[PDB]
Every structure is written in structure tokens, then in C-alpha cells.
Amino acid sequence: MSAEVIHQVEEALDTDEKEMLLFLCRDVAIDVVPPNVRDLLDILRERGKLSVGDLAELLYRVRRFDLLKRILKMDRKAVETHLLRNPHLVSDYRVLMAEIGEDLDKSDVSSLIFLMKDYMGKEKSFLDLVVELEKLNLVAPDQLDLLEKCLKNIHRIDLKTKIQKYKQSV
Amino acid sequence: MSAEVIHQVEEALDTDEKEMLLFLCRDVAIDVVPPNVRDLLDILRERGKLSVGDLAELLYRVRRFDLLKRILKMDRKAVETHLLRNPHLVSDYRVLMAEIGEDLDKSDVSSLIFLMKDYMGEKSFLDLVVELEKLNLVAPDQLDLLEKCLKNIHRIDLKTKIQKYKQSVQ
Amino acid sequence: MSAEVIHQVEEALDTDEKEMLLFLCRDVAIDVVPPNVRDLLDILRERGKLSVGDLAELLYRVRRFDLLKRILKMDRKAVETHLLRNPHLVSDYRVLMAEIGEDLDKSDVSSLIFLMKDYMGRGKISKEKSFLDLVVELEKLNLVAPDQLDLLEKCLKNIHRIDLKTKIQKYKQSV
Amino acid sequence: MSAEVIHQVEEALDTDEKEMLLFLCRDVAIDVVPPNVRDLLDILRERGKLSVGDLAELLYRVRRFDLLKRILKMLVSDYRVLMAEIGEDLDKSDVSSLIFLMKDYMGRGKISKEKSFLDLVVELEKLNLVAPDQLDLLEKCLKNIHRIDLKTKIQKYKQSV
Amino acid sequence: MSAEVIHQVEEALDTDEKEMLLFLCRDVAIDVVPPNVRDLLDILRERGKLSVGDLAELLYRVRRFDLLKRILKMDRKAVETHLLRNPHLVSDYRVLMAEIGEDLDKSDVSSLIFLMKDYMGRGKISKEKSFLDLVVELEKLNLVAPDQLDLLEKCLKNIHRIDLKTKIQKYKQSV
Amino acid sequence: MSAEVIHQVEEALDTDEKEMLLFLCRDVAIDVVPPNVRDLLDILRERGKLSVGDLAELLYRVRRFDLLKRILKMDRKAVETHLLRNPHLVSDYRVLMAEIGEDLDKSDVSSLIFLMKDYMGRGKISKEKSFLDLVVELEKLNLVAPDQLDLLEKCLKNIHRIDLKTKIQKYKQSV
Amino acid sequence: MSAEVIHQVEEALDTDEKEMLLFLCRDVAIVRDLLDILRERGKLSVGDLAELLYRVRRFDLLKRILKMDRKAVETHLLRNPHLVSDYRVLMAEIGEDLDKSDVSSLIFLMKDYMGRGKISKEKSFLDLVVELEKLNLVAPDQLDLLEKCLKNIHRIDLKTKIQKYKQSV
Amino acid sequence: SAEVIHQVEEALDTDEKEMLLFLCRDVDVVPPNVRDLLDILRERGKLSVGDLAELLYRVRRFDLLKRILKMDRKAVETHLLRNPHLVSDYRVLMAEIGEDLDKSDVSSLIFLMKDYMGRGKISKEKSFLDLVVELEKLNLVAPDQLDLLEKCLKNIHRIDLKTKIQKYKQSV
Amino acid sequence: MDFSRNLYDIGEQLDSEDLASLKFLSLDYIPQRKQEPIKDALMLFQRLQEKRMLEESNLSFLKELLFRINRLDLLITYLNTRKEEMERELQTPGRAQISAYRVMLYQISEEVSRSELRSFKGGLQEEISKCKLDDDMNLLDIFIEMEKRVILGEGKLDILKRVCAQINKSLLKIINDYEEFS
Amino acid sequence: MDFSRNLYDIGEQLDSEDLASLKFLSLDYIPQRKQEPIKDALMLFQRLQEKRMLEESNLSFLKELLFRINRLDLLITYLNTRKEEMERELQTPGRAQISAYRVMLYQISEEVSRSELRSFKGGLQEEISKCKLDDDMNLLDIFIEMEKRVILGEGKLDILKRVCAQINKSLLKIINDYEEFS
Amino acid sequence: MDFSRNLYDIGEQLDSEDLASLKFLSLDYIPQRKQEPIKDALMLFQRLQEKRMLEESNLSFLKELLFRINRLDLLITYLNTRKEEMERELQTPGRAQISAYRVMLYQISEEVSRSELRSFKGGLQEEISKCKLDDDMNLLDIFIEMEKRVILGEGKLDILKRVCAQINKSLLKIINDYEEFS
């Protein structure tokens, strides 16, 4: 709510969680690309889509529960119930992409980009690669064939199972 | 057409995309020094050179198919058919220069700068290309200097691309 | 309270506060537009509308309490009380426009002028202009008025700023 | 509505295009200096040059095509347009080098205000250091700033006539 | 003293300390607001409130001792002795604000302006302002005073800087 | 105290003790995160929680008595007495975690992160991590707390190590 | 008599250039009306007309009006006696090399000497020279104070030029 | 001349420009850019071909000397020895000391000297020459007294530069 | 542009360790500040070209640098110079642009293995505290650190001899040969 | 999705030792600077692709590399080529893109055991000091080091024969066979 | 975390030799590049989990691996499965996830002594270089090397039979049984 909460949240997070937060909030800011997490939070507050519940949900997606226990004075049960009842902000596709990118180590992404180089043109992370793929209109919540096939080819079948489960859910 | 469309296009673009688009439109605004991409779009509109097809061509040339689908409501196939039928705004020489500039790395461009420091007297490949154009060293009809420099740095794939382009002009 | 007081008040202000003051007082001085702050103060004093209450209201609207305390020797609480009791000289529409102009920055006003250059024209707002200048230009064409604010709300929503739109709707609901 | 269209056109023009139009119409406005485009039209009317065909040619060089279409509702020396093109092709980082290089030729205080290339060309033309048939100083200055492409345009203009 | 010394002092100062010098002299020149250093110094000279001791005090307060040795031909001990036996041209509150303003780095002033961007206009401080500019803006709203410093102390504590808070408390206990 | 002593202290510590100090000083400056030891010490000095006794305690808790002997010219017995009388900067939970991390070799943290791999992911465990990093991750997930140590005790028991479980029980009975 | 020549001369010169012509003829006689009266006095002539254009460094009017470029008049200038003294053209040259960022230093430093009032209007170097000449602080054969001021404003090339002119005559 | 200034200014670095400005601070008004500094020096009459050669030799750019001024090291060195100096020996010594400190050393120096100077006055990511000019402003480093500089340099375990300072002191 | 092409070809054949050796050997003509951002041979070649120590008609310094790191294949292949000519040229007094002390330090650095390096690092704990005993560094960095605190110089060699006497003897032979040349 | 997948599948079956052998065999088309930051076969394939020695319509060099290091299962599975065709193709003069000198060196390097390696290191203490006699150096590193100091050129093989005569005669047989082939 | 604890308990008991046997048996599902850095049971279990061949619900593959390497105490202790049930499950067609080729190769390797291993090596010192025929190599590495040179395939068993005929008959009996099962 107040600027104190935003300042504390900015001070608490590190670089990796900041990048994950930017990726998660990429869709809600449909036309604005923010350079800092501070700018993103200011934009969300100005647009009126930021509240105590929404900020708690965003911090819960990043998996920082001590921040909920300290700043927002909330536990995981309350935010879980709020998700169950109140519709959430980030789509299931974004959190699925984050979950997939969490499991890929620092070496498999190089093999994946080498495989995918034929469709496009240097320490790329999986999140940056999927952002590029979405930019080239190759990966969409309706088009998940390329990612599933490429994950199968590099012999990572648990992630293929995750993608299949997500497709079955919707 | 409407100012809001070009405003959205200007907002969504990235800095590297902005620079590539600014360079790639040098053929049209040959007697204009554009300070910003928004001003470049305004100048193009006021000169009767910008339309739906032209904006689609510009966005397709910088590989932003998501912006074509989301904003201009055009897909890759339709814009490719328009490209095949309607004459291109930008000659293929600028396209070839941009394509080459996207593959060279930091070490390669540094070595190229060291090699080419003899003829002339950090900077990306696009700036080197425009500086070479300034001194009338490389032109769309004469590419011997660039071909020799690309062959001397043991990167012969780009030399193959240049040779294919030079064969295609006849 | 001779012309010395109004001279001090005029000279102490800076450019942006002077522009805000002229925009706020544009309604009362509809007979002649004052090119300078001195002219506006002189014509206000000539008609007799200038007084302790009027000057306190003007200095409180522009948010300059230093001049109010040092020159007029009046506290803000008394100004608020006798402003609630006495009729207001500045319209709520004007203070709303001033607040909206306060909340905007250079990028946002550039976005507004770029979006609305179609109606205004190139030569009218060619130079970089504040939001108050664009508001005056819009009011010249009678597109914005205390009884008609839909276009302003639409333009505000176009630049992705919902809090200002909610403030506009709150003011509309109040009146 | 001959007056309405010309009065409405003046609104869309900006300061840079007004300066460019004044430089282009220097030959037409030799007898009296034009203070503004609105007064420039009055001067042209006094000269009797009020004509749609002659007026539409100016916007072709000014490159403001949308207003040309509005006027169409659907003469000038080629030496001056070469100077206009060269001035428009020079970025703001090279005019400083130009004014520094030719500082000794003219008054240093005469160029105290920041100048566009058109103003510098006018100043050098008042001293007759640049002529339609004499371009050695201009070519040397262009070469010294390391822009050989504009030298090709200068040679093209020289060989054309 | 003469025009030559004023010219030499003006032309030998960078743009960073000119803002400090303008802020420090606001109390003396409050009837009018000066646009630049030369106008301020000339106004003080004409008003008779400028002398060799006043210029020495100003240069000592801006920490430019080399100019004191070169132009004024005085060292630190001489100017300190002169200051000890003469009234101060600048109050202790001003020098305290200036001293605090030099111990804040970019990462702290950015945090302060972000925290206190809600009390004032968002576009009021859109440009990157120094701590001195923020103090001037707060003084305009009559929130910080030579005898009232609670809000400033709380704001300083809000950014996790306690040594400056202790300095404020030391100054308060001094009076 | 001064900057010179901080610089001398920093120049003597190795990497492992630097990481241990960074982990130990988590509670005091929980609002921020310091990149290296020098910045952490600077932050502590700015917050006013740094003194000669505090630095002596921090050096003593990392088992570097030689520096405390020569850099600070202090004795360990005096530090122990000060700890007996003065309040402790770091709670016993942090020193217990540091002791457990010291007692664990390189081949057991891999087993620990494999046992608890269900909650976390491979991305964090791809790089080599010590026990302190795993403790920090568990704390971030709110799985381990100073008043909640059942999970860590069970995990330590599961890997056929009992003495560390005895130490955990000793600490738990200490409160 | 043709007034069209006078009209063309008045129009061709811009406003700032008229001050140079007024300063050049300070001691010759005592805007275009002054030129017309000088023609009546007989001192002004076609040959002397080109001297003003040569001094003011505006060579387009020589071809436009006089129909003779600098090539024809360069020898005549040496042949004809000096209509205007070199002391005035030296001051004109000095004012040519002074920019608007320097006149402020001159007026501020010399405010003590001349009248401190009516300084709101920004004055060129020629105006300051005229003001100094009014108080008899500067003479055609005495340029010591001007040299001192030029040295005080951190400008040495003009200080050497003053000495070169003084030693030349 | 005029073209030589342009050729010199178009073929220099950024830190090299800073060093040139610091060297020219001896000969006043603070120069904003190297172009303005050269214009001021030429207008003041102090600039000369020999002086420009000495200035370029003081910054070790002999290739520029040969390419522009058509002179070698021996000729310019003999000219400098015979003719009076333009830059004082103290400035050259300061520049030479500054050229021999890497990023860690200057970071340690600014951290040490931040004790009695404003945190925002020096801020971070600044060169040694900026610290030297700050000390000059504070009037504690002078061509006759360098005790504080020597002590601070010794605090960071750099004794070769201390020997350099001692040798300079012995020279005069 | 055949000269620049030749220099580029020479620079492409040098890995990181040889680049570090070249950087250490050229400390006389290149200060630390100009040397820190160097991470490729092209930057070093350009820095040398700025001081006019390397051009079309003057390649002697480059030949000496390549000779001192035993890269004779680059000498014969590109610069067209064999070992005998370089030995004869360097035997002539006044043709050595690199001081023999630096070459001696480099040769001592080459003749030390990993265990010998660790013993060398541990042998300095008797006289210097942990402040200058950074074990992460290599032998060249240790020599530079010793040079910084004027505990090891052209005229000061007692510490170096004392440390060398602990590990090997041929190093003492090299030091004695250098002293004989002095 | 087809060619890149095949290249990745081929590269997934090469361990560290085979990667080192491939890096050694390709020194004529990849300089030392590019050789240094390579740790998996994908980067080597990228380097070969940049020089246009490996693409969809040209697979000769990859087949030659895979046959030279004695990996025939990969050829018969992921590339569909038998031993006889490769042998006949390589026997044709003018088609072998790898010089026979490097092949001979690699074949020699495959015929040395640990005791033989230590004997080889001991025999090379004259021309090469103990610096390059590290116990972690393999025979290929020794060969590269000798090639650096122009003692093991394509026309200069006397030192190799002299060293090998003290270990086994099969190596001399291999060298003599190569020389007879010339 | 019962499943992970069970896997850790199982992996605690395995020694180096059983780890090598498991690595050999799991070649068809793990490439060589992933095989090289494997050093304990936990890494192998992670690799098996990554391919979804081992999880909470599915444990057939782990039981098959434990049965093949003849470790029944672990099966009866930490997995609650007996020998007869495992044999009955394996005899069902389609349940075995390891081909009979690998099983028979491992069984052959289990029945070779050091003298018989030396005889096997001497019988095959002609087609295989001495680099892979060192005394440290066991029979599994020899089999892998022979598979690498396409001299020992699923349908190609001439060399294996010829070598085994010179050592023992029971190995030929096992080969004949495998051929009969085919």
C-alpha cells in the first residue's frame, strides 16, 4: 500500500527473484517494459491493480514466505484461501513457465538454445529464452508443442509430464 | 494510422530494436537526422510514406511477429504475401547489413575494428557500417572491403551470405 | 495593506507558481486577460475583491505557506476555517485541474500532447507545454467544461492512469 | 477560399520548416526581407506570385507532403536546394567542427549564437566565399570533417551544370 | 570588495557549489530571490551587507580554503578567529542542513525522494533533485523550521541512518 | 571505530570467514543485504550498532583471536566478561547454525540437499553450496525457525549423525 | 539622383550592421538620412561608397550595387586616401572578435568607472567604446586603459594587436 | 593552426582527456572540455607548437607527435630541456603516481579518505586525479608539502611510490 | 592492410597464459592502470603501438617478446626469424629492450611446480603476515606484490635467495648467473 | 529440428577424452584462442559450422573425425556409413582434409602406457626443462609443447625418433612407415 | 520424505564395484557424457528419476537392477520383495526393461578370473590397441571398447565365441543359451 512496503520489498529481494517477478508481471503490464522492480511496482500501484492481497499473492508466487510473515503480516493459509476464492492476477501459463525454468540447470539451457537456433538468430537463462520465443510468436498458451518436443528431445520427461498435466488441466 | 497505434509501437519496442529500426529507415529519410523513433514515425506519417502495409513491413523486418498479430491484426503469411506483391520500402542491402550485424559477437567486432582502424582514423557493428558508409568505403554495389574483412577473421558463413546476395542482384 | 504587500507577493513567486495562479484566477478576470501577475493583482485590487480572505485563499490554493505565514501573518488552520465558512472564490473545477496537472510528469504530458495534437494542431502547442496550457486550449474549444468532463476522463484513461480517472469520477459524484 | 487555405497552412508549419522556406525563397524576397511566412505570403502577393502551381513546388522541396495533398485537395534555383540538403544531412555534432574550422575566416563573434548550416552558408555567401561556380572552400571544408559522400554530391552538382 | 574580486570568485566556482551558496544566502536575501551567484553577490555588495569578512565566512562555509589563500590571502585560523568575534551571516540551521546534505549519497537521496513523493506533487520533484532542493521544498510547505525538526529527524530515521539523527539531536541540545 | 581498523580487519579475513560473518550478521541488518564484508561493516557503522566491543565480539565469534590480539589490542577474557554482562549482538541460534555448519564436511551437504530436494529445485543445487546456504534457503521458505527446529533435527537424525542432534537438543533445552 | 540605391543599401544591411556604419563615421561628420546628408556635403562619393562595404566585410553588395567586386576596389582603396581613420577600424575588428559571453565581464568590471545607471539594456563593445570616448578616457593615440582592460579580461591576442597597431603608426 | 587542434582532439581517450585537463589546470577559469581548453590556451597566447609538443609528450602519445607535429622524442626532449617548462614538475609527478594505481587501490584510497570528507562529495567510481583535485580544493596537498599524501599512500602498502615522492623531495 | 592482418594472425595464436606472461614482461613500458583492462593480445599490441614501440619498420620489440616466452614457431612462421639470428642480436649489448632482471624473474616463475608453489607461499609466513600472503594468487602475482613493498628489487635479493634455497638449487644457479651478469 | 538434433545426439556420446582427441586433431582449423574455452562437443561443432566445414549438405569432415578416433558405432548408427566406404574414400588421394602428420602423431599417442609415458618424459629433459614435465601432462600436451619450440616439425623428426628408440621399436616402425609414405 | 529416505538408505550400502556394475547395466538409458561424472548412487538415482523411470509409484526398474547385480538382502529389507515374485514378474513378456544382451554380458563378466582375464586380453591383443588393454581394465571396459568398434553387436558374436572357446566351455554354454532364447 504505502511507499514503505514497496521500499522494503525492493530492499528484500535479490536479482534472481527480481527477474522472476518481472517475468511474472510481464503480462499484466501489457505495453510497458519496466527496467526496475521499483518502476514495475509503481506502475501497478498507479494502475490500481496493486493491493495488500495482490502483493501478497505476488510474493507468494516467488516463494518468499518470510516476507509475508514479516511485511504483510500474513501466513500462507490466508493467501491460499484468497487464491481459492478471489481470482488471481498471473495466469497459470506464466507460473508453469517459471516452474519449468526453475528445474533446468545451467547446462541444459545451452543445449536447448543450440537445438532451437535454427528458428532464430550470451549467458541466456531459460526465462530470457522463453521471452524471446514468445516475441517470435513460437510459444503461446495455445501453442506448447515446440517446448514439449524440445524438452523430450533432450531427455527431460518430467517437464514433459508437467506440460501434459497443465494441458489436461485446461 | 492513428496516433495511439504508433504510440503503442513506440512504447513496446526495446532499445536495441529502436536502434535497429532507426538505422534501417535511413533510405527513406535520407535528408533527416532523426533524434528518436517516435519522431521518425511522425516524420514518416507526415510524408505520406507510412501506412498499414508499411508499418507491417517495418515490424516484420525486425522480427516482432507478436506486435503484428496483437496490434496490426496481421499474421506472418499475410505480411509475407504483401511483401511479395507490394514493392518493399527498404532495399535488401540494408536487410543484409542488419542480418550480418546480428551475428557478430563482441570479440569479432573488436577484431574487425582493429583491422579496419588503418583505413579510417564498444561501438556496435551498425555504427561501424554507418561510419564506413560515411567515408564512401562500402556501398550496396561495392562490397569488396567488407567481404575481405569477413574472410580475414575466419568467419566464412557471412562471406557466403554476401556472395549469395551479390549473385541474387543479377 | 498597500501595494507594497502585493508587490512582495508578486515578486516572491516563481514561474510555475505564477502560471498556476494565473490559471486559477483566469475565471474571475474574464473581462481582460492579464499578461503579468502585477496586472492581475492590480485589477483584482481595483474591483475591491482583493482582501485578507482572498489573498489567503489564493496563497493556500497554490500551496505556498511560507508567504502566507511571513507576509499575511495568518495560520493555515484559520484560513481553512474561514474558507469553509465563507464562499469560495476559486471553482472546484480549477483546483481539480491544478491537482491533475500536479500529478503528471514530463513523459505523461508529452504523451497527452502527442495523442491530442490532431485536434490542437502543430503550431498551437509546438513548444513543450504544461498540462494547464493544454487544459486552456481544450477549454477554448469548449470540449471540457464543469458540466462536461467525459473527454478528459477518456484521455486520462488512454495513458494508463486510473487513479486520476477515479478522482474525476469522485468529483463528479460529489457534485 | 484562397485566403482560408493559405492561412490554415501557416498553422501546421514549424520553425525549422519556416527557416528552410525563407532560405529557399531568398531569391524571391530579395527586395525586402520577410519577417514571417504570413508576411511572406503578403510579399509574394505584392510580387504577383500568388499561384497554386508555384506554391505547391515549394512543399515538394520542404518534403511536407500531407499539406501538399491538402492544398491539392486530391522555379527556385537548384543551387540553394543543394545547400539545404547538405545542411539537413549534417548532424548536430558536426556543425561545431564546421564553425570551429572556419572561425578564422569570419568574425568569431558573428557565430557566437549556435548556428544551423543554412545560416553559415548565408554568412559565407555574404562574403562571396561560396559561389554556384566556386566550391573549392566548401569542398575542402567537407573533406576536412571526413565526409566524402557529400563531396560526391558536390561533384554531381558541379558536373550536372 | 570591488568588482574584480567578485568576478574572480564567480568564475572560479563549479556548478555543484553554486547551489550550496544560493541555499546558504536565502536568509540574507529574502526580500528578493536571485537567479545566479553574480547577481546575489552584487546585491549583497550594494546593500552594504557584504565585506571582506562576509566573503571569508561564505568561502569557509562552502569549504574552498584554497580560494581564501589565493584571493583573500587568509588561512583557516585567521577566518576562524574572525568568525569567533563577529556575528554570523549564516545561521546554524543553514550550515547544519548543508552539512547533512553532503553526507547523503545517491542511494539515500533517491530513497528519500521516493518515500516523500506523496506529500508533494509527483511532477514537482520529477527531476533528480539534491537534498538541498528537497529541504527548500519542505521549507516552502512550513514543515521544517529552525526550531521545528521532528519531521526531518523521523524521515532520516526512516532510511536507516542514525548518525545523522544523533547529529540533529546534538544540535538541538546545543540550543 | 575508524575506517583504518575496518580496512585492516577486512584485509586479513579469508573467504570462508567472510561468508560466516555475512551469515552471522543477518539478524542485525535484516532489512538490507550487503555484497561483501566491508560494505556490511560500513552499514553497521552507519546504523550506529558498531562499537569496539561489538567488533571484538564479532571477531571472537568467528575464532580469529590473533586479530583481536593485535588489531584491537584486546584479550579474549575481557571479551568473555563483556559477553557475560552486555547483551549479545547475535543470538545463540545463529552461532548454533554456524557450529553445525562447521562440523559438517563436504560430502554430507549433498546428502542433505538430496533428502530435502522435494521442496526446492535443481536450479539452486546445481552449484556447490555449503550448509549456511541451505540454512538460508530453508529460512527463506520458513521451514526452519529459532523456535522451530524439528525438521532439521529429523534430517540430521536420518543421515546417521547423532552428536549434532545432541547439540540441537542441548540448545533446545537451554531455553 | 536615385533613392532606389539608398533604399537597397538600407534594406540589404540588417539591424545589427547599422551600428558598425554609425560607429565608423563618428569623426567623419556630425540612418540612411545621415548617408544622404553626407552625399550633400560632398564627402560621400561612389568611390568612397565601396570603402564602407570593404570595411564592413559585406562583399555581395559590391557586386549587387557597385557592380565592381573586391578585385577592382582593392587597388583603389590604397590609391584613395583613407576616408575613415584606422583607429575606428581597429575598434571594429576588436568588437568583431568579442562574443556576447565577454561583454558582460567588461561592463561588470568597468561599471565602477562610467555611469552605473541605465545598464539594464545590454550594450555591445562599440557602445562601451563610445561611452569611454565621451568621458575622454580613451584617445586615438592613447589606448593604455583599453589594453589594461583587455589584459584583465584574460585576452592577450587583442592586447598584442593593440601594441602592433600602436607601433605601426 | 586550426586543423591540428581538431586532429588532436578527435584522437584522444576519456581518461586521457581528464589527465590533459588536470595537467593544464596550472594555466584562471576551469575548462569544460578539451576543445575549449585548447581554444583558451591559443587565445591566451600561451599555446605554441613547442608547447603543444610538450603537452602531448607529457601524456605519452608519441604516435600523435609523429603523425601531426612531425617531430620525434629526441627533438621534443631537447626543446623541453633547453626551454622553460609549461607544466610544473609537481603536476607531472602527480599524473605519474596516478597512472600506477589500479581499481582496488583507488577504491581503498577513497574508502580511507572518506573519513573526513563528504560521502557524496567523492561518491564512488572516481579516478585518483579527482581525489587529488579535491585535496587541492581542501588545501592540504601543495607543491611544497606532501606529508598527508605520503602517509595515506603508505597506509595502503605502496612504498615504491613513497620512494618516488622522497626522490622528488630530494630533487628540490 | 597486410601488417594489421599479420598482427591479428599472431594474436589469434596466443592463449590466456601466454597473454599473462606478455603482460608481466611489459610492465616497464606499460603502467598498471593501462594494463588492468587488457584481456586480449590486440589491446596490448595497440597499447604498444601508441608509444611507437611497434610499427611496420620496427618489429624488434615484438620479436624479443615472442623470443622470451619460447614461442619460436610464431617467429619462424610469420616474422621470418630463426633462433640463431635473435640470439646473435641479443648478444650484442644495447639491443635488449627488456631488463635482464625481469627475464630472470620470469624464468624463476616458469621453473616452479604446484607443490613447489605452495611451499613458496608457505615459506613467506616467517616474515610477512597474512595481509600479503594471499594464497589464491600465482607466483607472478607474489613477485609483483613483493616488488610493491620494495622487499624485492634489482639491488635487493636476500629474501629471494633465502626463499629459493629452501626448495631447489637450479633457481640459485639462475640467480647467481644473473648476479655474474651484474 | 532434424539436423541440429542429429548433431546433438552425436555429441552427447563423446566423453572428455574423446573431446580432447578431437580438439587435438583439429588444430589446423581452430587456433589456440578458440581452442581454450571449449568443454563440450557442441561448441566444437559450432566452431566448425562457422568455418563452413560442417553443414546439411557437407558431412565429410565429421565422418573423417569420427573414423580417425576409432568410433565406428556412431558412424554406423547416427550417420549410416560403414567402415569399408570410409576406408576407400580416405585412401583416395587429395580427399583427406587432415594431414597424415597429425594422424601419425595421434596413432603414436595411442600406443603409450603410464610407465612408457614416464620414460618419454624422462627422455625429453634436454631440450625441454622440467616446467613442461608436469605429471598431469599427457602425451598430446608434450607433442604440442614440442611443436611450439620448432623441434617437432613436419620435416623435423630426429628428436622424436631418438626419444622413441629408448622405449619400443613399434613407434619407430610407425614413423618409418609414415616417412616411406611421405 | 519417506521415498527419498528409502532411496538414500538403498544407495548407502552400494560400494564402488556395484556402482560400476550398475553404470554398465544402465548404458541404454544414460549416455556416456552423463555417465562420466557419476560417482555415487545418488547421482545415478537422480539421472534415472529425470527420465521418469524411477518414482514413488514406479519401482520396477530399481528392483530389476538390484536383482541383476545379485543383491537380494537389499530387496528383502528396504523394498519388501522376494526372489520368487521377482522372477515370476521378469518372466512375463514386456516387463523386463533391460535387454538379454546386457544381462548375458554381465553374467559372462561375473565368471572370469584374473588368469582367465589375462587369457582373454592376450586373445584380443591384435584388434585392440594396448591403451585400453592395461592391467587396470576389467572385462566390462573391454566389452564397452569392443562395442565401440562394432566388433561385438547384438547379432555379431563371432569374436566373443572365438575368444571364449580358448578359455572355457561354460561361457560358450551361456552364449548358446542366449542364442537359444533369441
From Swiss-Prot, chain A:
Residues 1-73, 92-165 form the DED domain. Residues 1-170 are annotated as: Interaction with FADD. Residues 1-170 are annotated as: Interaction with CASP8. This is CASP8 and FADD-like apoptosis regulator subunit p43. The gene is CFLAR. The chain holds residues 1 to 175 of 480 of the full protein.
From Swiss-Prot, chain B:
Residues 1-73, 92-164 form the DED domain. Disulfide bonds: none annotated. Residues 1-170 are annotated as: Interaction with FADD. Residues 1-170 are annotated as: Interaction with CASP8. This is CASP8 and FADD-like apoptosis regulator subunit p43. The gene is CFLAR. The chain holds residues 1 to 176 of 480 of the full protein.
Swiss-Prot record, chain G:
It comes from the Eukaryota. Residues 1-169 are annotated as: Interaction with FADD. Residues 1-169 are annotated as: Interaction with CASP8. Signal peptide: none annotated. Residues 1-67, 86-164 form the DED domain. This is CASP8 and FADD-like apoptosis regulator subunit p43. It comes from Homo sapiens. The gene is CFLAR.
Swiss-Prot record, chains I, J, K:
It comes from the Eukaryota. One of its GO terms (cellular component) is cytoskeleton. Generation of the p10 and p18 subunits requires association with the death-inducing signaling complex (DISC), whereas additional processing is likely due to the autocatalytic activity of the activated protease. GZMB and CASP10 can be involved in these processing events. (Microbial infection) ADP-riboxanation by C.violaceum CopC blocks CASP8 processing, preventing CASP8 activation and ability to mediate extrinsic apoptosis. Isoform 1, isoform 5 and isoform 7 are expressed in a wide variety of tissues. Highest expression in peripheral blood leukocytes, spleen, thymus and liver. Barely detectable in brain, testis and skeletal muscle. GO terms for biological process: angiogenesis; apoptotic process; apoptotic signaling pathway; B cell activation; cellular response to mechanical stimulus; execution phase of apoptosis; extrinsic apoptotic signaling pathway; extrinsic apoptotic signaling pathway via death domain receptors. The keyword Protease applies. Keywords: Acetylation, Apoptosis, Cell projection, Cytoplasm, Disease variant, Host-virus interaction, Hydrolase, Nucleus, Phosphoprotein, Protease, Repeat, Thiol protease, Zymogen. It is found in: Cytoplasm; Nucleus; Cell projection, Lamellipodium. Residues 2-80, 100-177 form the DED domain. Belongs to the peptidase C14A family. This is Caspase-8. The chain holds residues 1 to 182 of 479 of the full protein.
